[PDB]
From a paper:
Overlaying the structure of LTA4H bound JNJ-26993135 (compound 11) to that of PGP bound in the active site showed that simultaneous binding of the two ligands would not be possible due to steric effects. However, we hypothesized that by removing the part of the compound which interacts with the Zn2+, we would be able to have simultaneous binding of the PGP and the truncated compound to LTA4H. On the other hand, in the exudate of the LTA4H KO mice, over 80% of the PGP was still present even after 24 h, suggesting that LTA4H is the dominant enzyme for degradation of PGP in vivo. In both exudates, Ac-PGP remained as stable over 24 h at 37 °C as in PBS. This indicated that, as already observed by others, LTA4H cannot degrade the acetylated version of PGP. Although LTA4H is the dominant enzyme that can degrade PGP in vivo, the physiological relevance of this activity seems highly questionable.
LTA4H catalyzes the final and rate limiting step in the biosynthesis of pro-inflammatory LTB4, that is, the vinylogous hydrolysis of the epoxide, LTA4. LTA4 binds to a deep L-shaped hydrophobic channel which forms one of two lobes of the catalytic site of the enzyme. The second lobe of the catalytic site of LTA4H is a more open and hydrophilic pocket, and forms the aminopeptidase activity of the enzyme. While less is known about the physiological relevance of the aminopeptidase activity of LTA4H, Snelgrove and co-workers suggested that it can degrade the tripeptide PGP which has been reported to be a collagen-derived matrikine and neutrophil chemoattractant.
Numbering used by the authors: 4 to 610
Write the structure that this text describes.
Amino acid sequence: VDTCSLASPASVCRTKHLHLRCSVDFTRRTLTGTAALTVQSQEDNLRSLVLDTKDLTIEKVVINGQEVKYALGERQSYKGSPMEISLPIALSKNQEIVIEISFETSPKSSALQWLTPEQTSGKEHPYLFSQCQAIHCRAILPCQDTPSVKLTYTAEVSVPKELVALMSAIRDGETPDPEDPSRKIYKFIQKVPIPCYLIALVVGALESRQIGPRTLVWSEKEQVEKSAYEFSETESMLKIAEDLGGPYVWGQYDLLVLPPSFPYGGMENPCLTFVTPTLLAGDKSLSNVIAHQISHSWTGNLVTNKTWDHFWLNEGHTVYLERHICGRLFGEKFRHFNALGGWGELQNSVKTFGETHPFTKLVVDLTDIDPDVAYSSVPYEKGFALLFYLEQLLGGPEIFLGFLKAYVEKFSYKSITTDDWKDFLYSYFKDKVDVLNQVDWNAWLYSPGLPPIKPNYDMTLTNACIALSQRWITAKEDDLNSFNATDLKDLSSHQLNEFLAQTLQRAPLPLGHIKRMQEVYNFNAINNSEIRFRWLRLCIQSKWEDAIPLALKMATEQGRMKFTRPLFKDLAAFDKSHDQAVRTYQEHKASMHPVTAMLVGKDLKVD
Ligand SMILES: [Yb+3]
Ligand SMILES: [Yb+3]
Ligand SMILES: [Zn+2]
C-alpha cells in the first residue's frame, strides 16, 4: 500500500505501457492530448479502477472506441484528486485493456515550469521543463502515480517547429506536424520498464554536442561549450559504474543543462539526466553530482523504492556508489574525505530539524506528509552512513561492493522495501549473521537523530581544513594580521569548501574576522556555487550588511533549492535584511518554480 497514491494499488491492476500523444501550447501554458494506458487486471471480475490526477482537466475517457463513465473525487491537498473509471466489460485476471484519456494540464501544474523568453539564455524563445519526482507525474497525466508500478512508454510531442522536445527515453525521429505546418512532432521510446516519476519532458531552443560514445550534452547555445568541458569525465564515470553495478541497460546517457530555476542539483531521468547550471564551476570540481545521477541507472532506476517511505534505498545506495566512483578516479583518501563531509552534512540536518524530529528517521511514514516538505540530506547521508558502517563491519569495500552488485542483479526491474533489502543482506552475508546481529537495526532504521555508531574515517585530506577553521575560530583581534592568501595555497577547491563548511558549523564569527577573511582570501571573487553559497551564509549569519545584496542576488539569479532555501532563511533571520528577503520573495514568486515557491513561502512564513 502506497499512502502517497490515491490510485488502485499494484495488487488490483498494473499499468504495463503508456502511449502519450500531446501538444505543448506556450500561449495557454498547457500540455493537451491523450494518455493511452495499457492496464493489466490482477483480479477476477475487475469493473473499475482509480488513477491519480492533480489539477488536470479531463475531456473524455475512451475504451474499445466508446466513451466511458468516470468521476473525479474531492481534492486531497498535495495528493490531488482520484479519478475513478467505469470499465465497459468486466476483466479476468491477467487480461489487458487500453484506456485512452483526453486531458489538459493546468498552467499551475506542480510538475512544470513555463519560462518566458526573458527567463532564458537566448531571450528569443520560451522554455518548458518537468520534474515528476516524487509525486508530480499526476500533475502531467492521469496515472497510478506510485513507484510500486513500472511501465514502458512511447510518446509523440507536438511543439512549435523552431524548438526541440526531449524526454527520458530514446529519440525515435522527428517529422513536421501533419495537422499544423508551424509545428514539429518529436517521437520517443522507453523500452525498459520504469516507475512514472522517471517520465520527463523539456521543450526549448536546445543544441547538442557529443562528449562521449553514448553521451550528448544539451543546453541553450550559450551554455553548450562550458557544459561539454564541465562534464567531460562522464564516459569514464559510466565505465566505472558498469564495473561496480553490471551492464548499463539504458542505451544512451545524455545530459541536459537546465535554466537556473531547476530545483535540484541533478535528476536521474533515464537516457537524459537533468542538471543545474550551478555545476558550471569551470574546473569539473562539482562532477560528483554527475557520478550520483549515473549511479541511479542501477540504484533507483533498476532497483526502485516500492513507496516514498523507503526513499533511502534509492539515495543511500546511490551516494555509496557515487563515492566509490569518485574514489576510483581520485583515490581512497578522497572517498573518505567525501564520506566525512557527508557526516557533517548529516550533523547539520539533524541540528536544523532537531534530534527527535520524525524527518531525521531513515524510514519515514509519509501518510499525510508532502514528500517535498520531508525532503532533506537525511536519506542521503544517514543512508550512506549505514552502508559505510556495514562495509567496515563486513570486511571492507571489495566485499561490500560484491553485495551491491548481487543486490542490483537480484532486484533489477523490481520495486522493493527496507525489509526486502535487509532480508537479502542477511541472505548474502549468511556466514556473517553474528556480525549483522550486533547492528542496532531499530535505531539505524526507525529512530530520529544521529545514528548510534559513527564509522571510521581517514582524516588525511580533512586535517588542513580543520586546522585552518580552528585557527580562525580561536583567533582574537591581535591574531587577524597573521592570516594571508598563502594559507590557501595547498588547498584544493574541495578543501576550501570543507574549510568553509567547518567554519559555518560554528557561525557566527565576529564581524572583524569575516571582514579580514574577505581582505586576505577574496572569497567574494569565487564563482564556484558551493563555495560561494557557504561563504555568503557565513557572512549573513555573521551580520555583514555588505553581503546582503550578494546573498539576495544568489538566492534569486538561480533556484537550486539547496542554495535558495537557506539563503532566504538566513536573510529572513538577519534583522537588517528581513524586509528585503520577504519583499524579494513576493516580487519573484510568480516567476519561480512552483515547488521552490511553495517551500520558500513556508520557510519565510509568507502565504
Ligand atoms: Yb526507430
Ligand atoms: Yb592575543
Ligand atoms: Zn538522488
